[PDB]
């Protein structure tokens, strides 16, 4: 260990490049309780799009549960003025920071809320090379987030409109 943690900033375009679909690959956190929300998940496809009011972004997803069910979700994020952090509507305690990852099609989030933090790994590919997952696990372990979750991604993605 020692960060090679590299921030992606939107205070400085980031939006246009990151539009479209992303897959949830893995999470890491100080303990398992703060990842357990993902235990029933087989896979998740997300779609990010521009918002319709200043500083807003639309995030949509469909979650494939391990029991085969498809569950639509949506959130509205807000870019904090003069900051690299994002807020999420309806969750006043929550903050998200974005980081580059070792793999080309990847992106890493750190989420914090009341009492917890977690790192979350996404990729443009639903099945990125195993090296991407390993590098994520190593980076986060060194940052003291040693509890780990890998999404199994054994089922098909659910439908999510463009
Ligand atoms: C707006 C993000 C800016 C980055 C845009 C490009 C990258 C997008 C990658 C996908 C990010 C998905 C983040 C969502 C995570 C949720 O699963 C958790 N917050 C749980 O939410 P819960 O189910 O508890 O509500």
Curated annotation (Swiss-Prot):
Effect ascribed to mutating residue 110 to Q: Loss of glycosylation
GO CC annotation, single? extracellular region
Q: Give the UniProt keywords, A-Z.
A: Disulfide bond, Glycoprotein, HDL, Lipid transport, Secreted, Signal, Transport
The GO molecular function terms of this record are: antioxidant activity; lipid transporter activity; phospholipid binding
SUPFAM superfamilies according to UniProt:
Lipocalins
Binding residue positions for tetradecanoate:
111, 118
Does the record carry Ribonucleoprotein as a key word?
no
The family database entries (InterPro entries) matched by this protein are listed as: ApoM, Calycin
Family matches, as Pfam families: ApoM
Tissue specificity annotation = Plasma protein. Expressed in liver and kidney.
UniProt keyword annotation of Disulfide bond present? yes
Chain positions carrying an annotated carbohydrate: 110
What Gene3D superfamilies does its record include? 2.40.128.20
Q: Which domain of life is it from?
A: Eukaryota
Subcellular location(s): the record lists:
Secreted
Primary localization class, coarse: secreted
One Gene Ontology term of the biological-process aspect is: cholesterol homeostasis
Cysteine disulfide links:
1-142, 70-158, 103-132
Family named by the database record: Belongs to the calycin superfamily. Lipocalin family. Highly divergent.
- Function statement: Probably involved in lipid transport. Can bind sphingosine-1-phosphate, myristic acid, palmitic acid and stearic acid, retinol, all-trans-retinoic acid and 9-cis-retinoic acid.
This protein's assembly is summarised as: Interacts with LRP2; LRP2 mediates APOM renal uptake and subsequent lysosomal degradation.
Q: What is this protein called?
A: Apolipoprotein M
Give me the gene this protein comes from. APOM
């Amino acid at each position: 260990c020692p960060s090679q943690l590299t921030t992606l900033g939107v205070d400085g375009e980031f939006p246009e490049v990151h539009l479209g679909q992303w897959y949830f690959i893995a999470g890491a956190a100080p303990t398992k309780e703060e990842l357990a929300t993902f235990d029933p998940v087989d896979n998740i496809v997300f779609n990010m799009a521009a918002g319709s009011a200043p500083m807003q972004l639309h995030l949509r997803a469909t979650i494939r549960m391990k029991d085969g069910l498809c569950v639509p979700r949506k959130w509205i994020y807000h870019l904090t003025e003069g900051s690299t952090d994002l807020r999420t509507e309806g969750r006043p305690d929550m903050k998200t920071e974005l980081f580059s990852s070792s793999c080309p099609g990847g992106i890493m989030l750190n989420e914090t809320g009341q009492g917890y933090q977690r790192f979350l790994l996404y990729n443009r590919s639903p099945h990125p090379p195993e090296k991407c997952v390993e590098e994520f696990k190593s980076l986060t372990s060194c940052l003291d987030s040693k509890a780990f979750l890998l999404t199994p991604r054994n089922q098909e993605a659910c439908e999510l409109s463009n």
